[PDB]
Amino acid sequence: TNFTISVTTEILPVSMTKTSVDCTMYICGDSTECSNLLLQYGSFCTQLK
Amino acid sequence: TSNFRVQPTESIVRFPNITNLCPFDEVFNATRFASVYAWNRKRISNCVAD
Numbered sequence: 001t002n003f004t005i006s007v008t009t010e011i012l013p014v015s016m017t018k019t020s021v022d023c024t025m026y027i028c029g030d031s032t033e034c035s036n037l038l039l040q041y042g043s044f045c046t047q048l049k
Numbered sequence: 050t051s052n053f054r055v056q057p058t059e060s061i062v063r064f065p066n067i068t069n070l071c072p073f074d075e076v077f078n079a080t081r082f083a084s085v086y087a088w089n090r091k092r093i094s095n096c097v098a099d
């Protein structure tokens with residue numbers, strides 16, 4: 001017989017903060033030995049970036 | 050692609066100005082040394098070592 005109108009919340013996430021890392025600096029600050037080791041490995045973390 | 054960082058320009062070193070010439074000759078240039086069954090210990094601190 002009688003109707004009412006009510007409002008309800010509904011929250012859905014969209015996205016997070018985009019994060020990017022670096023292969024060289026995360027391993028070490030300014031050491032060229034890290035670069036030599038990562039070159040003689042080859043390509044391991046370029047696909048990660 | 051790559052990273053940009055500023056390389057260092059000069060070099061600085063800073064050590065404490067204490068100069069006491071740690072007695073390495075007291076433990077090295079000594080006449081008698083203790084045996085292995087009873088070894089002695091000498092503590093060296095608060096000086097400069099060469």
Ligand SMILES: *[C@@H]1O[C@H](CO)[C@@H](O[C@@H]2O[C@H](CO)[C@@H](O)[C@H](O)[C@H]2NC(C)=O)[C@H](O)[C@H]1NC(C)=O
Nearest residue numbers: 001002003004005006007008009010011012013
């Ligand atoms: C349907 O329901 C609404 C509220 O759910 C009724 O509105 C209330 O009516 C009474 C008496 O008529 C008043 O004292 C209130 O102040 C009203 N509330 C309001 C305006 O928010 C309405 O009367 C109902 N209708 C029927 C036909 O039953």
Ligand SMILES: *[C@@H]1O[C@H](CO)[C@@H](O)[C@H](O)[C@H]1NC(C)=O
Nearest residue numbers: 073074075077078079080081
């Ligand atoms: C070592 O000890 C001996 C005996 O006390 C002393 O003659 C000598 O000058 C000391 N130093 C060196 C470098 O031999």
